[PDB]
Write a protein that binds this ligand. Structure first.
Ligand code: GDP
Ligand code: CA
Length: 160
């Protein structure tokens, strides 16, 4: 496919929140023994425009990809409050290490584990709003809201 832009995304968050899984769900749209996908690409369509997305689970060239990041998916696990409590630390890196146009989107992953919910939708939304973040709850496992996660960022990126 004949893209016209390249948006670089980072994905960041505590270990085990589902970053690789989110990346794989988005880039393959579908192996516990594996380390887990680190990097991926996908040509999406956003406002009648074809854009190549580069997506990197980042946890020299790394610093240069950071500085050129159009978007940043900041991920927590809704079943583990500690991953939510670490969000201000990730946001500091996400802001400090990228550039002034970088669109940050908060993702509350593992939403399918509803019986294990440890963080409310509401408190997380208030954090997002306070910090000017887009915010979705998602499930990398089922695929619920995973495209929207990547596509919502991309639409806001395109407006600049
Ligand atoms: N139930 C559920 N498990 C998930 C989800 N996303 C990831 N996992 C599991 O969480 C574990 C760690 O996921 P991974 O993507 O490697 O996390 P990472 O360390 O953030 O890259 C694995 O056993 C995944 O199968 C999800 O949306 N729902
Ligand atoms: Ca990973």
């Amino acid at each position: 496919y004949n893209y016209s832009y390249i948006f670089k995304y980072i994905i960041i968050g505590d270990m085990g929140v589902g970053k690789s899984c989110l990346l794989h769900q988005f880039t393959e749209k579908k192996c516990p023994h594996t380390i887990g996908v680190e990097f991926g690409t996908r040509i999406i369509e956003v406002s009648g425009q074809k854009i190549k997305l580069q997506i990197w689970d980042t946890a020299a060239v790394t610093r240069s990809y950071y500085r050129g990041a159009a978007g940043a998916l900041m991920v927590y696990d809704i079943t583990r409050r500690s991953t939510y409590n670490h969000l201000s630390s990730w946001l500091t890196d996400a802001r400090n290490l990228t550039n002034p146009n970088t669109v940050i989107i908060l993702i509350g992953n593992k939403a399918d584990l509803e019986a294990q919910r440890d963080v409310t939708y509401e408190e997380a939304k208030q954090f997002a709003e306070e910090n000017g973040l887009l915010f979705l709850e998602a499930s990398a496992k089922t695929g619920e809201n995973v495209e929207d996660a990547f596509l919502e960022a991309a639409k806001k990126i395109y407006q600049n």
